[PDB]
Curated annotation (Swiss-Prot), chain A:
It comes from the Bacteria. This is Small ribosomal subunit protein bS20. One of its GO terms (molecular function) is structural constituent of ribosome. It comes from Mycobacterium tuberculosis (strain ATCC 25618 / H37Rv). Keywords: Ribonucleoprotein, Ribosomal protein, RNA-binding, rRNA-binding. Was identified as a high-confidence drug target. Disulfide bonds: none annotated. Belongs to the bacterial ribosomal protein bS20 family. InterPro entries: Ribosomal_bS20, Ribosomal_bS20_sf.
Swiss-Prot record, chain B:
Keywords: Ribonucleoprotein, Ribosomal protein, RNA-binding, rRNA-binding. It holds the Pfam family Ribosomal_S4. Residues 90-156 form the S4 RNA-binding domain. It comes from the Bacteria. This is Small ribosomal subunit protein uS4. Part of the 30S ribosomal subunit. Contacts protein S5. The interaction surface between S4 and S5 is involved in control of translational fidelity. GO terms for biological process: ribosomal small subunit biogenesis; translation. One of the primary rRNA binding proteins, it binds directly to 16S rRNA where it nucleates assembly of the body of the 30S subunit. With S5 and S12 plays an important role in translational accuracy. PROSITE patterns: RIBOSOMAL_S4 (PS00632), S4 (PS50889). It comes from Mycobacterium tuberculosis (strain ATCC 25618 / H37Rv).
UniProtKB/Swiss-Prot annotation, chain C:
Keywords: Ribonucleoprotein, Ribosomal protein. This is Small ribosomal subunit protein bS16. Disulfide bonds: none annotated. GO terms for cellular component: cytoplasm; plasma membrane; small ribosomal subunit. Belongs to the bacterial ribosomal protein bS16 family. One of its GO terms (biological process) is translation. One of its GO terms (molecular function) is structural constituent of ribosome. It comes from Mycobacterium tuberculosis (strain ATCC 25618 / H37Rv). The lineage of its organism: Bacteria, Bacillati, Actinomycetota, Actinomycetes, Mycobacteriales.
Length: 85, 200, 113
RNA sequence: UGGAGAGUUUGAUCCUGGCUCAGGACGAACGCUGGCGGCGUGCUUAACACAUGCAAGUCGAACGGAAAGGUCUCUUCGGAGAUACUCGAGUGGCGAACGGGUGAGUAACACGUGGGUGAUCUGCCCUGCACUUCGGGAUAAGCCUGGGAAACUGGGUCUAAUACCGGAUAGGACCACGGGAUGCAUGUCUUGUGGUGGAAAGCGCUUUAGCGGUGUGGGAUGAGCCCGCGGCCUAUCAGCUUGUUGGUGGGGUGACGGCCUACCAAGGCGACGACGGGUAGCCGGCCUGAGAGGGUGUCCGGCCACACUGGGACUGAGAUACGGCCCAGACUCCUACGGGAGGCAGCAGUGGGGAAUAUUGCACAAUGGGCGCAAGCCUGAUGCAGCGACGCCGCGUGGGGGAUGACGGCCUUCGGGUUGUAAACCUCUUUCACCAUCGACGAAGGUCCGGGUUCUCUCGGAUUGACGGUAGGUGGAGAAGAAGCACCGGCCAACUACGUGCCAGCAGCCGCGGUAAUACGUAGGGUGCGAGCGUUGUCCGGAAUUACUGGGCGUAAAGAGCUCGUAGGUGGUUUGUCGCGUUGUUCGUGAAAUCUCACGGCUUAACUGUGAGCGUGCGGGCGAUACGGGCAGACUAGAGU
């Protein structure tokens, strides 16, 4: 890069990329554990995995990583996935 | 630009004495040059063209400037020959001629061009300045006690003054009453062949 | 941010201006949201007009004026009647007028006789 | 409120019908010539390749620090003291997505205009309401070392924060059941119970220095997405389509949706031109025209697309990320051959292409923007200047007398005629240039400074203008310093002489030239224009020669060899009704500029300010029902039996 502040901002783009990626990668595994627990038909674990997964989607939305409507659309699809079970 | 040439030559070709009083004209009223005494073909285009030339060399107006005067005259309500001769009669060098301050048209043009006048207390030096209704036409205090401005003090009688403007006593100043309509316009020319010239 | 700013639209040496409500992400002579007055800094006081009832709308909704427009609102009393400052009356001043076209013309006919 | 024609087919005529011309226009170019000013405007071709300098930073009132400066400073006699204003590098915040450029791609919801969004997002800004609570682990810098020719990079220690991380409590997240209003089907809005949940950060202070933080209600603004309608050529392109068209369940996004996926259905589109081919950024507008139309998209203003070529994501409120990232490709450069670097379609400039398009200018004084509590710093945006008659507009180069129709030139019927009041001479005035002098407006503000406590307010001070010692004023001298270009057979204003002899040449068309050429060349005279005048190219006009306004087809070009019939277009008399067409009115919208009109300001004009039209349309509401159409009947004249 040429401008002095674009060298600076190239360094802070990567640190924000590693921060956002580690948060988004853990949200995939939180959903994936719930999809397996809801495929066991338990409703014992899947009641309390649903409470901890929906809590993680809220905390990602408060850290600016996902959008608040993305947290809403994913919590509503996991909660209704338990009502069928 | 100006013309800056002989003045009787373009009164002989147009067959009409354009300046006031000429003994060189009326010894030869026929057109100048070596084929002057001919009996010439009078085209319809020639009657429209030479009528437009009678106004350009009366008022001292170039062709691009005279055409812009036609652009608004055809575009104002009323007529077209009325409003073209009105806005030619409102130019400052023509106003000075009608008031009697100059003998001819060309000396009326320098006295405006050399800045011997004011209008509303404002020093002007443009000869195609168009005066409006209620415009005072004053004169510079430096230009008083000058030869061409005091040689026209005693000659205030031999030419008539039109009705639309007015001259007063030793404080020389010219007051415009209204814009001149038709009847107080001096007529060496008709006003319809100019209008028919620009339709070609 | 919504700004109340000036808009240069005169000749080369004659900067006429319009008091316009625009966006900050916008060039000078672009689309304004609304024109709420004008400003000619070439007369001898100046020529200042603000709409002053649409100015009271745009200030009451959050439009931040620029620093020449903020001076103009203090002269017209609009910034004072918005913030609650006591100078809410207009302290603007027009030029001392000229006698009209007819009045000078008759006073030359009165002086010549 | 606004419309002109002429030439040319014939021995002559009328008609038909082509061709050519006169006018306007330009981002122009070339030829001849060239005084000044005001104000516009300038790579149309190679989205070709680019040397050098600049075009985006800011905050110490976020934080650790202390390389530079200024200090109280030890006193070294060139070594000191973070305690300290101040500040290079660094972390952190905000900005960098705006502004500026270009027009390659694009025939498309790209643009224009009008709607929808009960299908959505929106940093900073404004306001209502809540809150601002406990803790923790690092690390850049620094310091010490390793690799590398470089560009850069490794490791060990070390230190902060408004950096980061984890809890407490906080409804506009989520699930289920409720009422209550609402309609336009999915529903939306408002409230209730129960069960799950998710924030924050401090820093400064002369002693009213003051700035910030987070969650939620509502605005404002910017934006996304869908739809009606409108603006090219081509059928010597006629079958296109398989995530294709629809459904269901999941996924996905800010949001609807085949946007993606699985499964099921077998559709969708097309002669009202699908699918192809060619070309093109679209528009406000500009040019022309009496209008209707036709041509065009240059300055300026709007939206879109791109940023060496192609592809991709990251960060963020927001990304075609020009002056960011990563991969691939072409090209240029560096290398110790292991590897690295670069992207003017920013401003200025260079090369090249071309008929052809400018300075490696000045300033942040004004206006707009970024950051900052603020002073300020940044700004090739912008304001201005330079260069080019490139355009438009304006003004000069003299004026008043003056016959002795002077000299000369040209013509001559040798008498004269003409250039020509034109010179000469006498005389008047100096706009501009020139010299001298004064000297701005843009600045009811920018900074400091007393009162004016605050905010504000000015008595009033200080200095602050790139343009610029410019414009403008005043003085000085003298007609003094300043005119050319085309054309003259007809259209079409303006005619003779000599030279030449189908030669040399001219010419837009008909044509002129072969020994008396108003058409070739020069001369005199003349006409049209004038700091310009011609020529070429291009567009419209004339052209009623694509004809809606506004044409034709017996013989001039033009009725299919004839019929049947599909789509389509058109339809007798009458009752009732609907109100789609049509028509009246009103509201919303049709930006600004440009254009028309009227006033104002630049000494006038161009130019520019304001007001009103215009914006022919489109949407919403409410009237009318004659005509057209729809719907529900009647009729017998057309048609058929
Ligand atoms: Mg920074
Ligand atoms: Mg993993
Ligand atoms: Mg979902
Ligand atoms: Mg003919
Ligand atoms: Mg024949
Ligand atoms: Mg013939
Ligand atoms: Mg030239
Ligand atoms: Mg030359
Ligand atoms: Mg210029
Ligand atoms: Mg180009
Ligand atoms: Mg620093
Ligand atoms: Mg800040
Ligand atoms: Mg950009
Ligand atoms: Mg620590
Ligand atoms: Mg916490
Ligand atoms: Mg909680
Ligand atoms: Mg499938
Ligand atoms: Mg779904
Ligand atoms: Mg589906
Ligand atoms: Mg193209
Ligand atoms: Mg016509
Ligand atoms: Mg353009
Ligand atoms: Mg351009
Ligand atoms: Mg290039
Ligand atoms: Mg993001
Ligand atoms: Mg950038
Ligand atoms: Mg660049
Ligand atoms: Mg350039
Ligand atoms: Mg060349
Ligand atoms: Mg500035
Ligand atoms: Mg500023
Ligand atoms: Mg310029
Ligand atoms: Mg010039
Ligand atoms: Mg002088
Ligand atoms: Mg003739
Ligand atoms: Mg001869
Ligand atoms: Mg000749
Ligand atoms: Mg001129
Ligand atoms: Mg031509
Ligand atoms: Mg033509
Ligand atoms: Mg036509
Ligand atoms: Mg015909
Ligand atoms: Mg027929
Ligand atoms: Mg025949
Ligand atoms: Mg025939
Ligand atoms: Mg037949
Ligand atoms: Mg046949
Ligand atoms: Mg039919
Ligand atoms: Mg009928
Ligand atoms: Mg029908
Ligand atoms: Mg308009
Ligand atoms: Mg005017
Ligand atoms: Mg005026
Ligand atoms: Mg205007
Ligand atoms: Mg209506
Ligand atoms: Mg019958």
């Amino acid at each position: 890069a040429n401008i002095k502040s674009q060298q600076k901002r190239n360094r802070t783009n990567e640190r924000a990329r590693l921060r956002n990626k580690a948060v988004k990668s853990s949200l995939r595994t939180a959903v994936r554990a719930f999809r397996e627990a809801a495929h066991a038909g338990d409703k014992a674990k899947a009641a309390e995995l649903l409470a901890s997964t929906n809590r993680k989607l809220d905390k990602a939305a408060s850290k600016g990583v996902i959008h608040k409507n993305q947290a809403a659309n994913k919590k509503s699809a996991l909660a209704q996935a338990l009502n069928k079970l | 630009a100006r013309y800056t040439g002989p003045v009787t030559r373009k009164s002989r070709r147009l067959r009409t004495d354009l300046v006031g009083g000429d003994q060189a004209f009326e010894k030869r009223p026929y057109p100048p040059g070596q084929h002057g005494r001919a009996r010439i073909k009078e085209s319809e285009y020639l009657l429209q063209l030479q009528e437009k030339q009678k106004a350009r060399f009366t008022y001292g107006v170039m062709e691009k400037q005279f055409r812009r005067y036609y652009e608004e005259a055809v575009r104002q309500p009323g007529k077209t020959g009325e409003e073209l001769l009105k806005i030619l009669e409102s130019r400052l060098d023509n106003v000075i001629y009608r008031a009697g301050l100059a003998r001819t048209r060309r000396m009326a043009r320098q006295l405006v061009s050399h800045g011997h006048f004011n209008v509303n207390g404002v020093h002007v030096n443009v000869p195609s300045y168009r005066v409006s209704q209620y415009d005072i036409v004053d004169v510079r205090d430096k230009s008083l006690n000058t030869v061409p401005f005091q040689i026209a003090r005693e000659t205030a009688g031999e030419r008539p003054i039109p009705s639309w403007l007015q001259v007063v006593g030793e404080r020389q100043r010219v007051l415009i009453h209204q814009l001149p309509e038709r009847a107080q316009i001096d007529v060496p020319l008709t006003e319809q062949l100019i209008v028919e010239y620009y339709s070609k | 941010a919504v700004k109340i700013k000036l808009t240069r639209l005169g000749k080369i040496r004659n900067p006429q201006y319009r008091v316009a409500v625009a966006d900050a992400r916008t060039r000078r002579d672009g689309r304004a949201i609304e024109v709420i007055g004008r400003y000619h800094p070439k007369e001898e006081p100046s020529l200042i007009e603000i709409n002053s009832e649409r100015a009271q709308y745009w200030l009451s909704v959050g439009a931040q004026p620029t620093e020449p427009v903020l001076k103009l609102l203090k002269i017209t009393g609009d910034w004072q009647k918005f913030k609650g400052l006591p100078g809410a009356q207009g302290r603007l001043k027009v030029a001392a007028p000229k006698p009209s076209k007819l009045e000078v013309f008759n006073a030359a006919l009165a002086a010549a006789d």
